């Protein structure tokens, strides 16, 4: 049967970028042509593979990662990028093989008084490894004195809200992102294209 990309692309609610979702896709026939013509996308970029070539390729597993970021941050979802999102929320390797798909979701993820359900990590001691997920909410120690889980001076809550409002500019509007990774191991493949 077909691979269930619709459960990722057409989900009614998306995850925060710091707690990004990942769907492992296995033991199915992937139909990329219908997937890539399923909707209109504001960003469509592939690395190490052509979009039209996936119909001929077989992979051990395919990963579909999904999250919401703001418009001016979609450029960070790419190999070799730095910034708050790539350093502290969602990181792609330098030799990333896959595709990055994004579309404006202002009509879905903004609210009248500000949508405060989508957050990103603002403070972190060190950069994430590629494909790492950090869901810690520990108070960030910005100075010498320890925080003991209490907010205050030099003691910051690590997450920040986007506060999406539909009247914002496009750079500040929410964008849903789907990243397709293609894990090629020395094992029998389970996901081939048609």
């Amino acid at each position: 049967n077909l691979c269930p990309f619709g459960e990722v692309f057409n989900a009614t609610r998306f995850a925060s970028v710091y707690a990004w979702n990942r769907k492992r896709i296995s033991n199915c026939v992937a139909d990329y042509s219908v997937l890539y013509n399923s909707a209109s996308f504001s960003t469509f970029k592939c690395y190490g593979v052509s979009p039209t070539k996936l119909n001929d390729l077989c992979f051990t597993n395919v990963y579909a990662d999904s999250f919401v970021i703001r418009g001016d941050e979609v450029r960070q979802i790419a190999p070799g990028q730095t910034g708050k999102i790539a350093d502290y929320n969602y990181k792609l390797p330098d030799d990333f093989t896959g595709c990055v798909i994004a579309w404006n979701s202002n009509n879905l993820d903004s609210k009248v008084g500000g949508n405060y359900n989508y957050l990103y990590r603002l403070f972190r001691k060190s950069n994430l490894k590629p494909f790492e997920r950090d869901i810690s909410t520990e108070i960030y120690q910005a100075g010498s004195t320890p925080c003991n889980g209490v907010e205050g001076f030099n003691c910051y809550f690590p997450l920040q809200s986007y506060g999406f409002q539909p009247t914002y500019g496009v750079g500040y509007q929410p964008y849903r992102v789907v990243v397709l990774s293609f894990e090629l191991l020395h094992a029998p493949a389970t996901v081939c294209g048609k």
Epitope: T82, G83, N127, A142, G143, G163, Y168, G171
Partner: antibody, heavy 119, light 107 residues
Framework: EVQLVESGGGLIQPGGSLRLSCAAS????????MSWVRQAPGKGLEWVSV???????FYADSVKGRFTISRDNSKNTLYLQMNSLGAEDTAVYYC?????????????WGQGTLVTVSS | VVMTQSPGTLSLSPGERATLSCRAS???????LAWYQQKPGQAPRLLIY???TRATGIPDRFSGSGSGTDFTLTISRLEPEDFAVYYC????????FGGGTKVDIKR
């Protein structure tokens, strides 16, 4: 008792190099967003460079390729190496904790140090 | 997103109410707007952040509001020591400052 104390300013000939220092007390440089902001005589404020706690660095187009921001954890000091200096680089340079984004504003500020590019 | 501050200089007597504007060519969210005060020969100081949240230790007479393309800094009960230059500042892809507004005090 949070202080940012700057040094390194002064006279430098055009095309020369200089390194500024920003010694911190009351906060840890390697754990914060640390920025440099400059102000030409009689003019406004211009952001120049920032370093993230995780090591990433960013620069304004006016200084890209000539400036380098860095830090020393054991000395709790921020630095700004300035190369290929010209008359447009003559300014009072401030260091500040933060980057100017939500939950991450420029606070506190150093006292500033003046750099004069002249022959 | 170019920020434009107006007026360039403002001349008001003590006790009056000061109105400093910061317009934007494109819409900027409130939570991305901040105000800084710089007195002669001194470093800039954080005044307001998130468009309307007063910084630590800042007197109550300073208040900010506005959203999108129009932000306002208000100095109720203007005092002689409020003589300074005031900058708005926002973040899109990098930190950007406004041109600044000088507040002269009449006597």
């Amino acid at each position: 008792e949070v202080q940012l104390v700057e040094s390194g300013g002064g006279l430098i000939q055009p095309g020369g190099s200089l390194r500024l220092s920003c010694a911190a007390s009351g906060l840890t440089v390697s754990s914060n967003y640390m920025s440099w902001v400059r102000q030409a005589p009689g003019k406004g404020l211009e952001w120049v460079s920032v370093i993230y706690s995780g090591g990433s660095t960013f620069y304004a187009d006016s200084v890209k390729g000539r400036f380098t921001i860095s830090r020393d954890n054991s000395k709790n000091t921020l630095y700004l190496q300035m190369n290929s200096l010209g008359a447009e680089d003559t300014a009072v340079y401030y260091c500040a904790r933060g980057e100017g984004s939500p939950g991450n504003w420029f606070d506190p500020w150093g006292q500033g140090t003046l750099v004069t590019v002249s022959s | 997103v170019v920020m434009t501050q107006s007026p360039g200089t403002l001349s008001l007597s003590p006790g009056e109410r000061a109105t400093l504007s910061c317009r934007a060519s494109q819409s900027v969210p409130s939570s991305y707007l901040a105000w800084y005060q710089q007195k002669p020969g001194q470093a800039p100081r954080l005044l307001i952040y998130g468009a309307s949240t007063r910084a630590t230790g800042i007197p109550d007479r300073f208040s900010g509001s506005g959203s999108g393309t129009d932000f306002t800094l208000t100095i109720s009960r203007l005092e002689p020591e409020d003589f300074a230059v005031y900058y708005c500042q926002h973040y899109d892809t990098s930190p950007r400052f406004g041109g600044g507004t000088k507040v002269d005090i009449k006597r």
